[PDB]
Design a protein around this ligand. Structure first.
Ligand SMILES: *[C@@H]1O[C@H](CO)[C@@H](O[C@@H]2O[C@H](CO)[C@@H](O[C@@H]3O[C@H](CO)[C@@H](O)[C@H](O)[C@@H]3O)[C@H](O)[C@H]2NC(C)=O)[C@H](O)[C@H]1NC(C)=O
Ligand SMILES: *[C@@H]1O[C@H](CO)[C@@H](O[C@@H]2O[C@H](CO)[C@@H](O[C@@H]3O[C@H](CO)[C@@H](O)[C@H](O)[C@@H]3O)[C@H](O)[C@H]2NC(C)=O)[C@H](O)[C@H]1NC(C)=O
Ligand SMILES: *[C@@H]1O[C@H](CO)[C@@H](O[C@@H]2O[C@H](CO)[C@@H](O)[C@H](O)[C@H]2NC(C)=O)[C@H](O)[C@H]1NC(C)=O
Ligand SMILES: *[C@@H]1O[C@H](CO)[C@@H](O[C@@H]2O[C@H](CO)[C@@H](O)[C@H](O)[C@H]2NC(C)=O)[C@H](O)[C@H]1NC(C)=O
Ligand SMILES: CCCCC/C=C\C/C=C\CCCCCCCC(=O)O
Ligand SMILES: *[C@@H]1O[C@H](CO)[C@@H](O)[C@H](O)[C@H]1NC(C)=O
Ligand SMILES: *[C@@H]1O[C@H](CO)[C@@H](O)[C@H](O)[C@H]1NC(C)=O
Ligand SMILES: *[C@@H]1O[C@H](CO)[C@@H](O)[C@H](O)[C@H]1NC(C)=O
Ligand SMILES: *[C@@H]1O[C@H](CO)[C@@H](O)[C@H](O)[C@H]1NC(C)=O
Ligand SMILES: *[C@@H]1O[C@H](CO)[C@@H](O)[C@H](O)[C@H]1NC(C)=O
Ligand SMILES: *[C@@H]1O[C@H](CO)[C@@H](O)[C@H](O)[C@H]1NC(C)=O
Ligand SMILES: *[C@@H]1O[C@H](CO)[C@@H](O)[C@H](O)[C@H]1NC(C)=O
Ligand SMILES: *[C@@H]1O[C@H](CO)[C@@H](O)[C@H](O)[C@H]1NC(C)=O
Ligand SMILES: *[C@@H]1O[C@H](CO)[C@@H](O)[C@H](O)[C@H]1NC(C)=O
Ligand SMILES: *[C@@H]1O[C@H](CO)[C@@H](O)[C@H](O)[C@H]1NC(C)=O
Ligand SMILES: *[C@@H]1O[C@H](CO)[C@@H](O)[C@H](O)[C@H]1NC(C)=O
Ligand SMILES: *[C@@H]1O[C@H](CO)[C@@H](O)[C@H](O)[C@H]1NC(C)=O
Ligand SMILES: *[C@@H]1O[C@H](CO)[C@@H](O)[C@H](O)[C@H]1NC(C)=O
Ligand SMILES: *[C@@H]1O[C@H](CO)[C@@H](O)[C@H](O)[C@H]1NC(C)=O
Ligand SMILES: *[C@@H]1O[C@H](CO)[C@@H](O)[C@H](O)[C@H]1NC(C)=O
Lengths: 410, 274, 405, 183, 49
């Protein structure tokens, strides 16, 4: 013997209770239709500064910040051969198929033989004096090799700061790079280092910078530290592979549809609405950071609501094996014989204007309504019997009711 | 904060008819800030204060209250009457400082972020440049040098496009310049608000002329690509050369340092912070 | 003295799958491993709501009255149903209408709440819970209360003025004082009743209890809605952000944190709803005991009804309970009088006497009521024969007639 | 619930300790066993707190059962509806699986007769003397005493009646005077 | 019980914030600190209830 939970709301109840037989009672049973894609006209991110000139070293890293542009990720991944990547709170497939509000890229010439010194908890010279990765946004660290046919010009060698200190009569005072900032010894080290353990000195600030040399490889090896942000700008940075054609919302209003509103992905219910909030920001939020409205290009304001489920109830009667479905607190227009009741639309009950005394009601349906098995299920109304009325007498004394005959009740 | 003074509006989003707690760069309550006044010249020699000899620290940034008392009549600073207009501050921010050959004022080594109002207050020009001092009579490589200024002669001007710039070029040689941005300003007399802050994504400039012009809420309008940490700023002394019959007043401005504080913001139905 | 006793709590059922996964199809595959916990949560909530419905039916069956009667100088306008009604309910009283207008309750919506929330609490459909309707609509509860307002094995049809006369004669005041001061009694009664509408303010204990009873349900619903914003160590509290920002070997790890966190929070919601549900059932038993003692009869027990000597009390409907109006007898002035333990004659067998519900006060010896000073002649109706005591007053000049021969 | 909280995996690869030991490694065995340890300790804390609420509830309800025995079982209760329905006569108590089970015998009427009653009766003497009944009424069909719970017209007597003060609500008798009102 | 709930490690390397700060690196400190934060906020909810 088996039960297909799907077919009927009573099954669902039997599968939830995990028993072929369930008692009589009023139980509760468990209860992406389009696309609204809105995007800008289009703009290309300028990746030429990294792909054109000579790459800099670890201490003198160059940083590009991109906002409100589209970039060809496939072309960039075709230009470079990735040796090793390690991401934090994000994955590169989500970088391929998503949009972010900003994109910060730090790139420099870096040998793959020193790839362990760029790691998360490393204590080498690179982390102490050259570059410290910042872990406060979703970020990735990519080490890639540039082929010989690329437009980049290989440097003379690989340089990095070995130590950077200052001061006298207190010993050496080590100066250590900050999280995501340049080293204090940058002005001494801009010229670079030519021999191993070559030391440069500045007489004004009494700062000393010492470097180290790695031989230049056959193919230029470069390192990337990218970082992404969410919910910062009105526009967004999106890969060209994630761009889809625009769709309007003049139809499909009032249904749970997926939206891509200038890079904002989610699902919800859109309704035409009176304009609130500031138009320029474009996105109206609530206290909890849920998208409340969207000031659209069409010109209309659309108050966004998360798509919901209509609550369900089952009025099961075990002796007659008859059930009815209550749609909780929703009118019968939406459900579209259903009958509108004080507890919502219900299908499976007939209305016959029958009244049942309190104590005769075995299936109470919310308010003063009942389902009786008189087989078919009928909608009733609970009404208690009014007390016996003893009429007063206009005469000198009063009228009293004294018991004749009795019984014993336990 | 009951008038929402110096409040940077959240970027990329808006709120409507709610109150929520925000942590960000906000000024302290009851902070008087720093008074800076721009006066009128003697047409004689220029009249300035010692706004250049002071060493200010950028920290997290600052907010400038521009245009207060832009309709009141006060005695002139140089003749202690006349109506008072609104003047725009000129800034000079850099990461590294040094000294001139005469050890006077502040020099900014390497790349310097210079913000100058342009076109007699009709536009704002922002550039990162390395400025190399000039060797002349009163220019900063001489013993006769006192301070560097920028001057606008309202007589005789306005419309010269490079008046603030030619005033800056009088003192420095602009070489190695990464960028030059220009933003147009409509001529008004409303009290405004301006902010500068540096993040990991560059230098952000905020203003109340973008949105909430009649109030005080500041909105982002420029994200400058400066990634070296700014450590010092100086207010360039600005002087106006006009006749004795033409002397007119100029509103002072206040600079309040920003701090990492928690604020409770009240939003209206229109979305503003009041 | 107004007293509120809480009868119900808000019946809330939770759709566990909708609450945990929010309709994201990748979450249901992970939740199928945690299959039985959602069913156990639903079964526990269903049992709690069923027990609360049984308690409501038992209370409203206990407070019904077998016979009723169809008002002197007493003004019972407030207690009775308004002749022209400002209330959508035809059985509600005026004072019940005032009490329900001064307490603010969010309208859950039982007939068309979904359409009202879709046009232009409404968080039930979003979060995944649902407020079940109460067992009786407020019209039927007001009908029960109004039938009780009309009101042993025998029923006497004496009017309200006669009932007040007998109830205030039973506490110590003699018949002569009630006959002489009838107009003042009616004026004092009507005036006290007229302060009931002005008593529905703050810094009142019963109204504060009503407000806290209203606020407890809202606090429970707010906790249930706000536990969905907890990240539980994940990168976001939204399933969509996890699914669109991460990759499948790491998505199931982070979606799970949300699954395990939300089920534990739901379990703690079920546990605190069980404590509140059994707490509200013992109150209903108390509320009926109070109806059967203070309302259906005159209570001789001190302090159970309101302050002072109890005379009569009325009960109306309140948000999630019943609201009482205990009319008591309090004195404002008093006189110090010399009383006697008893009086004995000078016969050869000494016969001694003692008062009933009164004192033998002086200014020779007179009888007065225990709750009002009115010196009356000592009679056989006022006094009971008692054995002699040495602290009794041996009176020989003027002897009351019950001690004569 | 206590037995079924052991089936929760708590984010681990399995809810069984042996499966974790036989499928994982001494670096990551303790990372998953500690998830079972922390999850089960929190589950035990929720069970203990639930039992403390249930124990203090049954301890107060056992005091209610002792008061119900002392009022309904050991004596006849004069309260209205405290024990059962109708007028209380006698009660019995037996043992239940987790408490005490009571059987409250009550006097309930079935039929009734409307009768004309009197507040009291007074004679025609120059000092008026008045009487009032106890545990009953003065009914007709001239005036007879009857019980307060059963209709049975009986002759008025001293036993049936108590004296009272003169009231204007009382009936004044001239024709037939009961023996307690005789001079 | 309220004082003894602060001695629970909740799966971290230590129950002290100071030990987590001086023994781990910023990729992994917020992973263990959030474990202590979520554990103590849940134990505070049980104390209030
Ligand atoms: C800020 O500006 C100062 C001044 O221009 C910069 O210092 C200069 O840095 C360059 C390159 O780092 C130095 O040039 C080098 O000179 C040596 C010979 O001394 C030569 O062998 C090298 O090939 C290279 O050309 C220059 O001497 C040095 N000048 C001074 C006065 O320090 C500084 O680097 C700038 N800071 C930043 C962060 O760019
Ligand atoms: C100095 O005086 C001038 C006089 O014009 C002030 O300009 C005026 O400022 C008020 C500020 O409330 C402006 O009123 C606004 O009008 C807009 C419609 O344009 C309305 O939507 C706003 O709600 C508000 O009522 C007024 O328009 C403006 N005058 C002009 C000609 O633009 C200036 O604000 C004064 N400055 C100071 C510092 O007191
Ligand atoms: C992203 O870059 C790739 C390669 O640089 C582009 O692919 C080329 O598209 C043109 C036109 O369709 C073809 O003729 C080439 O053969 C393609 N090359 C490769 C290697 O696929 C692609 O079109 C770019 N995407 C966008 C949106 O411009
Ligand atoms: C800053 O302070 C210095 C003093 O150290 C001022 O330098 C003086 O300038 C005047 C005017 O040219 C000369 O007569 C003095 O000889 C200078 N003194 C020294 C010690 O150099 C400088 O003018 C001040 N800058 C201001 C006020 O902007
Ligand atoms: C390799 C020499 C090992 C010497 C071992 C003796 C003592 C070392 C004590 C602690 C080791 C910390 C350094 C671990 C490697 C850092 C990797 C890097 O630098 O990026
Ligand atoms: C530290 O102590 C050493 C030796 O006692 C001394 O040479 C040095 O100057 C001291 N440094 C500081 C900063 O106190
Ligand atoms: C997308 O829209 C463009 C119009 O710019 C159209 O040419 C193209 O065919 C569309 N593609 C799809 C898949 O709808
Ligand atoms: C949306 O509503 C606005 C005002 O409420 C109205 O001006 C506009 O025409 C409406 N648009 C549609 C498509 O109904
Ligand atoms: C049932 O039918 C009667 C008669 O038409 C009607 O008055 C009543 O409202 C109906 N009840 C419901 C719940 O529709
Ligand atoms: C219930 O019955 C009473 C009389 O017995 C009547 O006045 C009232 O209208 C009835 N109510 C319903 C809902 O049937
Ligand atoms: C009481 O009623 C029962 C049935 O209702 C009947 O059998 C019995 O005779 C009656 N007794 C009297 C005294 O009327
Ligand atoms: C704004 O909020 C207040 C209270 O928070 C409310 O009374 C008012 O109706 C709201 N206004 C609008 C337009 O929603
Ligand atoms: C500027 O001059 C004033 C003169 O009162 C003086 O108080 C102030 O310290 C000076 N500022 C600097 C930086 O020297
Ligand atoms: C510039 O010279 C003055 C002269 O005393 C000195 O106080 C100041 O510290 C110097 N500043 C720099 C940046 O060297
Ligand atoms: C500036 O200060 C430095 C600091 O020692 C000094 O060597 C130099 O001589 C000073 N120059 C002048 C012009 O005062
Ligand atoms: C500044 O630029 C002018 C332009 O011709 C040049 O003559 C002068 O020598 C420059 N000054 C310095 C200090 O380089
Ligand atoms: C700024 O104003 C000038 C002068 O009216 C005009 O030539 C220029 O195009 C404007 N720029 C922008 C961006 O509006
Ligand atoms: C009884 O009190 C109500 C309260 O407003 C009043 O309207 C009514 O007139 C009063 N009754 C009499 C008879 O005065
Ligand atoms: C009354 O007489 C009794 C009998 O001797 C005596 O004990 C008592 O003290 C007397 N009381 C007074 C007040 O005289
Ligand atoms: C006598 O009895 C009648 C009976 O109705 C009553 O009305 C009246 O008040 C009594 N007293 C007098 C003094 O008539």
């Amino acid at each position: 013997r088996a039960v297909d939970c799907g077919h009927d709301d009573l099954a669902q109840l039997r599968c939830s209770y995990e028993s072929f037989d369930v008692d009589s009672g009023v139980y509760s049973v468990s209860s992406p239709r389009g696309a609204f894609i809105e995007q800008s006209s289009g703009k290309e991110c300028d990746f030429s500064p990294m792909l054109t000139g000579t790459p800099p070293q670890v201490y003198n890293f160059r940083r590009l910040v991109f906002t409100d542009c589209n970039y060809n990720l496939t072309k960039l991944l075709s230009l470079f051969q990735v040796s090793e990547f390690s991401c934090h709170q994000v994955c590169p497939d989500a970088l391929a198929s998503g949009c972010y509000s900003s994109l910060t890229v730090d790139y420099f010439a870096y040998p793959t033989s020193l790839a362990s010194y760029l790691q998360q908890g490393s204590t080498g010279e690179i982390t102490q004096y050259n570059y410290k990765q910042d872990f406060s946004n979703p970020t990735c660290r990519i080490l890639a090799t540039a082929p010989a046919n690329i437009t980049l010009t290989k440097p003379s060698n690989y340089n990095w700061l070995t130590q950077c200190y200052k001061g006298s009569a207190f010993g050496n005072q080590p100066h250590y790079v900050q999280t995501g900032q340049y080293t204090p010894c940058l002005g001494l080290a801009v010229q670079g280092f030519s021999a191993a353990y070559q030391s440069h000195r500045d007489p004004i600030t009494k700062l000393v910078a010492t470097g180290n040399i790695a031989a230049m490889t056959d193919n230029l090896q470069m390192a990337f530290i990218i970082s992404v942000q969410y919910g910062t700008d009105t526009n967004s940075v999106c890969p060209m592979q994630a761009l889809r054609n625009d769709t309007s919302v003049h139809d499909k209003l009032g249904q749970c549809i997926d939206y891509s509103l200038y890079g904002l992905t989610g699902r919800g219910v859109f309704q035409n609405c009176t304009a609130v909030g500031l138009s320029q920001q474009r996105f109206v939020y609530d206290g909890f950071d849920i998208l409340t409205g969207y000031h659209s290009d069409d010109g209309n304001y659309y108050c966004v609501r998360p798509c919901v489920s209509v609550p369900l109830s089952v009025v099961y009667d075990k002796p007659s094996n008859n059930y009815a479905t209550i749609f909780g607190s929703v009118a019968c227009d939406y459900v579209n014989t259903p009958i509108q009741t004080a507890v919502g639309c219900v299908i499976g009950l007939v209305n016959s204007s029958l009244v049942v005394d309190d104590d005769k009601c075995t299936l109470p349906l919310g308010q003063s309504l009942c389902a009786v098995p008189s087989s078919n299920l009928q909608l009733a109304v609970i009404n208690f019997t009014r007390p016996h009325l003893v009429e007063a007498l206009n005469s000198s004394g009063f009228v009293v009711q004294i018991p004749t005959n009795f019984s014993f009740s336990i | 904060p009951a008038k929402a003074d110096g409040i940077i509006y959240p970027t990329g989003r808006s709120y409507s008819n709610i109150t929520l707690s925000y942590q960000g760069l906000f000024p302290r309550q009851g902070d008087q800030g720093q008074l800076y006044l721009y006066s009128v010249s003697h047409i004689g020699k220029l009249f300035i204060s010692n706004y250049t000899n002071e060493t200010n620290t950028f920290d997290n940034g600052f907010v400038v209250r521009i245009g207060d008392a832009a309709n009141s009549s006060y005695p002139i600073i140089i003749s202690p009457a006349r109506t008072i207009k609104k003047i725009y501050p000129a800034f000079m921010l850099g990461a590294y400082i040094g000294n001139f050959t005469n050890n006077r004022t502040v020099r900014y080594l390497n790349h310097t972020l210079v913000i100058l109002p342009e076109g007699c207050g009709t536009s704002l020009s922002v550039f990162y440049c390395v400025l190399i001092p000039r060797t002349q009579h009163r220019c900063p490589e001489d013993n006769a040098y006192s301070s560097y200024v920028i001057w606008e002669t309202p007589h005789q001007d306005c419309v010269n496009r490079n008046i603030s710039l030619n005033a800056f070029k009088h003192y420095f040689n602009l070489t190695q310049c990464k960028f030059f941005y220009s933003y147009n300003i409509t001529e008004d007399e409303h009290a405004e608000w301006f902010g500068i802050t540096q993040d990991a994504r560059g230098v952000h400039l905020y203003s109340s002329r973008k949105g909430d012009l009649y109030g005080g809420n500041m909105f982002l309008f420029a994200s400058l690509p400066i990634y070296d940490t700014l450590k010092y700023y100086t207010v360039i002394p600005r002087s106006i050369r006009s006749k004795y019959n033409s002397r007119q007043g100029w509103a002072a401005f206040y600079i309040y340092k920003l701090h990492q504080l928690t604020y409770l913001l009240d939003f209206t139905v229109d979305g503003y912070i009041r | 003295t107004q007293e509120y006793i809480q009868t119900t709590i808000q019946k809330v059922t939770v759709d566990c799958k909708q609450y945990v996964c929010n309709g994201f199809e990748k979450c249901e595959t992970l939740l199928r491993e945690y299959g039985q916990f959602c069913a156990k949560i639903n079964q526990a909530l269903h049992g709690a709501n069923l027990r609360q419905d049984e308690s409501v039916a038992n209370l409203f069956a206990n407070i019904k009255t077998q016979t009723t009667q169809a008002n002197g100088d007493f003004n019972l306008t407030l207690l009775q149903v308004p002749k022209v009604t400002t209330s959508q309910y035809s059985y509600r009283s005026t004072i019940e209408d005032l009490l329900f207008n001064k307490v603010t309750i969010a309208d859950p919506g039982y007939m068309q709440g979904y359409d009202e929330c879709m046009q232009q609490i409404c968080a039930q459909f979003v979060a995944g819970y649902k407020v079940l309707p109460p067992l009786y609509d407020p019209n039927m509860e007001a009908a029960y209360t109004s039938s009780l307002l009309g009101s042993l094995s025998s029923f006497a049809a004496i009017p309200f003025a006669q009932s007040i006369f007998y109830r205030m004669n039973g506490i110590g005041i003699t018949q002569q004082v009630l006959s002489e001061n009838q107009k003042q009694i009616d004026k004092k009664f009507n005036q006290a009743l007229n302060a009931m509408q002005t008593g529905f303010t703050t810094t009142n204990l019963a109204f504060s209890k009503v407000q806290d009873a209203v606020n407890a349900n809202a606090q429970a619903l707010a906790k249930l809605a706000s536990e969905l914003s907890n990240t539980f160590g994940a990168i976001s509290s939204s399933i969509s952000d996890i699914l669109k920002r991460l990759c499948p070997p790491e998505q199931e790890a982070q979606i799970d944190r949300l699954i395990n966190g939300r089920l534990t929070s739901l379990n703690a919601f079920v546990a605190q709803q069980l404590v509140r549900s059994e707490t509200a059932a013992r109150s209903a038993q108390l509320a009926s005991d109070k109806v059967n003692e203070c309302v259906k009869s005159q209570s001789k027990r001190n302090g159970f009804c309101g302050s002072g000597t109890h005379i009569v009390s009325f009960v109306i409907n309140a948000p999630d309970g019943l609201y009482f109006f205990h009319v008591g007898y309090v004195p404002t002035d008093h006189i110090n009088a010399t009383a006697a333990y008893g009086l004995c004659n000078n016969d050869n067998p000494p016969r001694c006497i003692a008062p009933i519900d009164g004192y033998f006060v002086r200014n020779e010896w007179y009888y007065t009521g225990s709750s009002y000073y009115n010196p009356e002649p000592i009679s056989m109706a006022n006094t009971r024969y008692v054995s002699q005591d040495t602290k009794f007053e041996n009176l020989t000049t003027n002897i009351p007639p019950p001690l004569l021969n």
